[PDB]
Scaffold this motif. Structure first.
Motif, mmCIF file in Angstrom:
data_model
loop_
_atom_site.group_PDB
_atom_site.id
_atom_site.type_symbol
_atom_site.label_atom_id
_atom_site.label_comp_id
_atom_site.label_asym_id
_atom_site.label_seq_id
_atom_site.Cartn_x
_atom_site.Cartn_y
_atom_site.Cartn_z
ATOM 1 N N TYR B 27 2.550 31.042 50.220
ATOM 2 C CA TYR B 27 2.254 30.824 48.806
ATOM 3 C C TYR B 27 1.739 32.200 48.332
ATOM 4 O O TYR B 27 0.521 32.419 48.178
ATOM 5 C CB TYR B 27 1.120 29.805 48.623
ATOM 6 N N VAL B 101 -2.935 30.210 49.350
ATOM 7 C CA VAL B 101 -2.465 28.906 49.849
ATOM 8 C C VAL B 101 -2.982 27.672 49.071
ATOM 9 O O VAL B 101 -3.356 27.808 47.914
ATOM 10 C CB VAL B 101 -2.855 28.779 51.333
ATOM 11 N N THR B 105 3.094 22.803 47.794
ATOM 12 C CA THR B 105 4.439 22.415 48.083
ATOM 13 C C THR B 105 5.185 22.417 46.769
ATOM 14 O O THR B 105 5.386 21.356 46.174
ATOM 15 C CB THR B 105 4.486 21.012 48.706
ATOM 16 N N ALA B 109 2.714 25.394 42.889
ATOM 17 C CA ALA B 109 1.989 26.580 43.321
ATOM 18 C C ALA B 109 2.455 27.585 42.303
ATOM 19 O O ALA B 109 1.650 28.234 41.614
ATOM 20 C CB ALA B 109 2.441 27.018 44.698
ATOM 21 N N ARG B 128 7.352 34.073 48.926
ATOM 22 C CA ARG B 128 6.952 33.455 50.180
ATOM 23 C C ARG B 128 7.221 34.405 51.380
ATOM 24 O O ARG B 128 7.228 35.630 51.212
ATOM 25 C CB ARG B 128 7.721 32.141 50.333
#
Lengths: 180, 136, 110
Positions: B27, B101, B105, B109, B128
């Motif tokens: 992330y 982080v 999912t 994010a 990523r």
RNA sequence: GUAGAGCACUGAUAGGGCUAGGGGGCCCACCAGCCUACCAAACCCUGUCAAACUCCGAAGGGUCCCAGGUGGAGCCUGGGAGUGAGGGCGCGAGCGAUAACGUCCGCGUCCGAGCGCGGGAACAACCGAGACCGCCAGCUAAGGCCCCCAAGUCUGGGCUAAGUGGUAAAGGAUGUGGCGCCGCGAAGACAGCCAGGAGGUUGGCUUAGAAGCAGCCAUCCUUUAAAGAGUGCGUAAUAGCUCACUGGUCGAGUGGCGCCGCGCCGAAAAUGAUGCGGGGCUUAAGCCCAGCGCCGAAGCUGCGGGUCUGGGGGAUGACCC
RNA sequence: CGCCUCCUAAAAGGUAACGGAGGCGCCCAAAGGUCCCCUCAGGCGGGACGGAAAUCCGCCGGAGAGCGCAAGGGUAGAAGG
RNA sequence: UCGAUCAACGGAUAAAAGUUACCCCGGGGAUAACAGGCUGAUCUCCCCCGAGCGUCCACAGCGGCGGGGAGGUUUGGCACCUCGAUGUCGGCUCGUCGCAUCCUGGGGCUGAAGAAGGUCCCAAGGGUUGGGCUGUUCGCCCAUUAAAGCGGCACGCGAG
RNA sequence: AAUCCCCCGUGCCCAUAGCGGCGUGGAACCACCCGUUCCCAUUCCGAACACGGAAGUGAAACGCGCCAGCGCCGAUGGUACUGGGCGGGCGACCGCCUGGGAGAGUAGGUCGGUGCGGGGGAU
């Protein structure tokens, strides 16, 4: 699967030009016998990308001498991404330096748990395994909370054994959202 | 912010490139055309993210409140010992590995970052894990 | 390590700086003992002191004084004519005081 | 030894594993158990910074001898001196707000003090260029050639078309054109079309109502247009609506995310207006790459002259190289 | 508003700034000579009056303790005990 | 070979403080003060993102956090024009341009019924009152008013 | 006498001459070893240094060889940097031409190579 197009000329001017066409410098290396072969990116990449390719070697075609290799180093590109030099080693028969792809399942007690999620630190293993490492070395458990964590010790090692790593040091651990 | 129990008073000024890159969770928020960035602004993002993310599962970090910026006086005429401590922050300049982080999912994010930095203070990008990394 | 070894390397380096050209390296202990001559690490090494030609392992720091005086003249002519000093794994009162007097006559020549 | 760099020297510091210092701990006189609630010397792993940290280490610069080495400087002795405050530009550190035609120091150029010519509109220091004096001579810099004004409204291949040219960022977008890529089941496509929009789908609470189109999840079945655990207009549930599907209709290409180069929105002014002006947008334009060509400096060559300096013939001149 | 040390002097050296930092205007009669010996803090393990830390034993260690005084250089192959 | 913060340390003397709106002589905008200049501190206006308020509704009305420009005003930075001379305030009188327009209209929007408000984009056309007190422009207050704007020009105006 | 070999010393090379793991030698080395009146010595002990000698042993210091786990070494490529000349951008700043071009990062590398005196080891 892999292959490439060599560099008679090497070092700077050349790799740069490479880049220019869409080719990045490549080091073909095998236990103290070395040659600068050069990288046609696009494809190169699809390949690399497989990543399964970076963890578990593959075969390359150069001239016509099908040979076994992996990346032991790579200069991927500062100012963005892509690279500056891709590095591969072709193997004879004793592959000790292995960062084999690792998968483990922290079957629920994690996020469906106290909100806490699991942090993957190791995820791969640099142990030993001569010309013999799977596309997937793995392990499992069913706890991801409290103040819980597990590592290289617990580990649970399969077939072509050999821990070149350490007496445990965090494959993974679980942390709270706003605690548990 | 945090640049606690420093050691000195002030730095100086320059900028040009450094060493941020990796990944660290998948992330990621990476700078690109900056320089120093307010430890605050920073916390800003921190917030932005933290809150968006259903407000719990932790994000991570990246840069630090690093240096002490001084406008010295308050608005006087200039010649102070250049003293005065005042704004503390980051010194990241070549698209840097800013790591956050949570367990979003998704483009969820995404948003988090979107605003966090859209905000923050520069031309920047995000992603990523794209070409792992092998150490000793 | 650095400890006793240094006992050594110390008499060493100091001895070394010292420079009047040559030094004999005596060597304490019984059959152990024996002293060889050296100069600048030019590479060379004049003559060798006393091949264990035992004369009286007895209360003989004199086994000593003897082997010494011996080496004394041995070199004395062994290598024509010169002047300098030496090493020693200790003070000059026993074994070493001995190699000393040995040398002592070596130069004294009477 | 600064840039870089690295972290083992010291100091930072971020997520991590082990550990104690505050602790629950009571069994409460062989007074020791889990938890751990602990600050962690720590801990190794994951992490990035330091002018006054550094295990590594340059990019040049410093300098001794040999060699280039004449322009023409190079050296020592010597009398006549002027500035002893200056600014600008580029790079490198200060500082200042990383503001100022600010001020501090340094490498370089500069401009004065020659820096008088070109020039970019016109502008001491930004690119070109050193003017001893001539020429109703020719080759060139920079930078220019529709015109105002010397020089192709050259050719060639594009891409914008807003007038960007003719100052601006954050950032916004079925702009324009370009990738290098995705959907083609002619088992004929998508927006446009036709009709059905199927029976258990009928509480789970709430049922005043879910009996998809009221809130706390449900994620199964049969069944064919293939099947909506029903994306949506909604009230009293309910009852009606578009496809999320054919299914048939059509068929023959469709909806995309990353990376690209060229534009628009964002960006409101004070005597009046403006890319220099006329002007101009497939040469006339402009941006990008291609090649040719002529223009234009006191800059360079050709007729000549003046002048000092080394040397050359020094006869006084002198002349000439 | 004199001097020492470190940074910025940008790597020769060497330079401002109302630029950063921080010390000295003592002495040490014997830290003045030389000869002979010795050799750190700290980590760990085991111990009388201990009892985070003396004193002693047992290991471990680019020497980071040390050198009146600040920094820096050095440096226990001691200038150090 | 001794006395010595001569310690503003290269040190005039041994032996020294002030004050001038009572003042006076030399030169420099190589130094302030006015204004101008460039910068923008900035303040003013605008623009992004959305935590979040708006019963319900992110954004009718609103914006946390952080962010990004415009402009030349306010409180500042500098030193070159100016010290052989540039009159600084307040006001007067005649004003001239400007728009982020106050009244004007044209508007889409509403949490818009009407009416009335309030929410932005367009547009300077004319217009944009009297007194009070205060040397104060600003300001607070009286009475209205369609309304009784912000500001550019040395904060226009001494050759008025 | 003057061949290599075992070595006891004692020299240049700064960690591949290190740590540590398995082994291994005294015949001859050499070490510990015996004891102390005598040299001379411990602010306590001859602990060390020392004197004073058969022995016993080779534990301990100890020398080679195998072992690379830690440590040390640490290339080829490769990027950053940049000496110099030019561009592109108001911008902080980006980029282009020409020589130099560490670091870390897989290689893979090592468990010393040797100066000289010499007991001597092999007529």
């Amino acid at each position: 699967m892999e292959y490439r197009l060599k560099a008679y000329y090497r070092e700077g001017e050349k790799p740069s030009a490479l880049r220019r066409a869409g080719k990045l410098p490549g080091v073909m290396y095998n236990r103290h016998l070395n040659r600068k072969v050069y990288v046609d990116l696009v494809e190169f990449d699809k390949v690399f990308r497989q990543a399964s390719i970076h963890h578990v070697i593959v075969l390359e075609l150069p001239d016509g001498q099908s040979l076994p290799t992996l990346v032991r180093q790579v200069n991927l590109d500062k100012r963005r991404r892509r690279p500056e030099h891709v590095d591969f080693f072709v193997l004879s028969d004793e592959p000790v330096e292995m960062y084999v792809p690792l998968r483990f399942v922290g079957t629920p007690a994690g996020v469906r748990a106290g909100g806490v999620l699991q942090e993957i630190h190791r995820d791969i293993l640099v142990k030993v395994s001569p010309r013999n490492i799977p596309e997937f070395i793995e392990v499992d458990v069913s706890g991801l909370e409290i103040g819980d964590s597990l590592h290289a010790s617990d580990l649970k090692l399969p077939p072509g054994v050999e821990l070149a790593v350490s007496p445990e040091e965090t494959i993974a651990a679980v942390v709270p959202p706003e605690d548990v | 912010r945090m640049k606690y129990r420093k050691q000195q008073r002030g730095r100086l000024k320059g900028a040009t490139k450094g060493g941020d890159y990796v990944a660290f969770g998948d992330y990621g928020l990476v700078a690109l055309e900056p320089a120093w960035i307010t430890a605050q602004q920073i916390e800003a993002a921190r917030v932005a993210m933290v809150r968006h993310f259903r407000r719990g599962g932790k994000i991570f970090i990246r840069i630090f409140p690093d240096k002490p910026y001084t406008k010295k006086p308050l608005e006087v005429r200039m010649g102070k010992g250049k003293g005065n401590v005042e704004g503390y922050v980051a010194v990241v300049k070549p698209g840097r590995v800013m790591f956050e982080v949570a367990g979003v999912t998704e483009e969820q994010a995404m948003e988090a970052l979107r605003i966090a930095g859209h905000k923050l203070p520069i031309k920047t990008k995000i992603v990523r894990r794209d070409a792992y990394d092998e150490a000793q | 390590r650095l400890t006793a070894y240094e006992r050594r390397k110390f008499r060493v380096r100091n001895r070394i700086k010292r420079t009047g050209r040559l030094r004999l390296s005596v060597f304490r202990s019984l059959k152990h003992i024996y002293a060889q001559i050296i100069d600048d690490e030019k590479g060379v090494t004049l003559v060798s002191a006393s091949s264990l030609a035992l004369k009286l392992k007895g209360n003989k720091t004199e086994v000593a004084r003897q082997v010494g005086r011996a080496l004394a003249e041995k070199a004395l002519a062994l290598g024509i004519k010169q002047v300098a000093f030496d090493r020693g794994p200790y003070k000059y009162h026993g074994r070493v005081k001995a190699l000393a007097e040995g040398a002592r006559e070596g130069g004294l020549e009477f």
